């Protein structure tokens with residue numbers, strides 16, 4: 001029993017978890033719920049031994065978790081990526097909470113039918129948010145320490161999503177673009193990206209008005 | 219000199235931090251931004267040494283953090299509240315994420331002009347959420363381990379806020395009410411709640427449609 005990751009067959013909250021596992025080279029299986037599997041999830045939700053049922057979930061033996069960040073952190077912790085003193089642990093948790101905000105800012109407008117309207121002040125406020133991340137990353141290859149951690153895969157997925165939303169916003173910060181290309185060049189990430197099990201779309205749940213549907217628009 | 223906790227003069231995301239610090243008896247001072255201090259925060263935000271500027275923030279000498287969860291976990295980690303193995307650290311991060319969701323479900327509708335309409339389905343789904351938390355707590359005095367941790371203050375505040383939104387929803391689970399009373403009976407929490415330092419209102423920012431304004435309604 002390789003561990004199992006359960007989620008919708010979408011990028012969403014689980015994509016940084018899959019990227020991480022692929023990068024560290026850990027075996028896993030996914031239990032994927034497709035667009036028509038709503039009732040199948042409602043059926044399983046309370047039968048999986050989960051203390052706080054939710055998606056995504058992660059199960060390994062008799063151990064189980066929910067909460068995307070707790071699953072990411074469990075895998076990161078096993079690879080020594082969560083820090084080694086109180087000050088370092090807390091800095092990593094601060095960066096995580098920032099990256100969850102960066103990805104959620106998209107999600108919180110993407111499901112509204114007024115998305116095209118909400119996008120306007122969203123795009124007016126985004127340069128200041130991107131500037132803050134650009135300054136924080138500065139000339140570093142990765143967000144914390146000298147090698148990839150779960151924070152880089154959260155950050156990569158948020159930037160790739162935002163870039164899809166408005167490419168000129170992210171292209172305005174050379175270090176953010178270079179960071180996207182850096183993560184995509186990692187040998188295990190490039191292999192995962194080129195493989196049949198990669199999910200390139202949708203970014204959000206299928207019913208979203210941005211980053212939803214079965215296929216990219218056009 | 220004592221650490222500084224900076225936030226709006228509202229309960230919001232900082233209240234579980236103030237509860238935790240009063241419980242463990244750590245000295246702290248608050249830098250409180252009032253209802254008309256918005257420009258004062260805009261003027262401070264980039265001039266406080268913060269790597270990822272936001273509210274709340276925490277500063278102790280040249281150490282600083284933002285992200286309410288990271289600040290809570292910093293304090294909690296100094297009091298050995300974040301667990302002692304990867305499995306136990308992960309379980310605590312899971313319960314944190316579910317409590318962040320529990321509090322955010324109120325914030326996500328409270329600031330919207332359509333709050334009164336959104337409240338209907340929110341109150342339709344709330345019982346199942348509270349039932350999950352009621353079964354998770356079960357007959358335990360606290361959410362994890364045998365003594366209060368940052369998880370309990372997060373959970374207390376989210377329940378008190380929800381209780382204000384719909385008192386009988388929470389009162390339908392006696393063990394959640396017993397937990398609210400148990401946290402309020404802790405001598406250091408009672409002394410805080412009876413002091414001049416305590417903020418009982420507003421629950422969200424003053425401009426919210428629910429839990430806003432300068433005093434509770436009617």
Ligand SMILES: N[C@@H](CCC(=O)N[C@@H](CS)C(=O)NCC(=O)O)C(=O)O
Pocket residue numbers: 012013045053054055056066067068069315316319
């Ligand atoms: N705080 C959460 C959110 C989890 C979540 O919102 N899950 C949505 C999918 S993005 C869901 O389908 N949950 C299943 C359910 O509520 O039954 C975490 O990061 O995992």
Ligand SMILES: N[C@@H](CCC(=O)N[C@@H](CS)C(=O)NCC(=O)O)C(=O)O
Pocket residue numbers: 097098101230231263271272273274284285286287
């Ligand atoms: N993920 C965050 C959210 C922080 C946030 O939304 N803060 C709001 C107040 S509740 C704010 O006024 N931030 C200051 C700003 O936007 O400049 C955390 O938990 O601290």
Ligand SMILES: [Zn+2]
Pocket residue numbers: 024025026079
């Ligand atoms: Zn490994």
Ligand SMILES: [Zn+2]
Pocket residue numbers: 242243244297
């Ligand atoms: Zn202390």
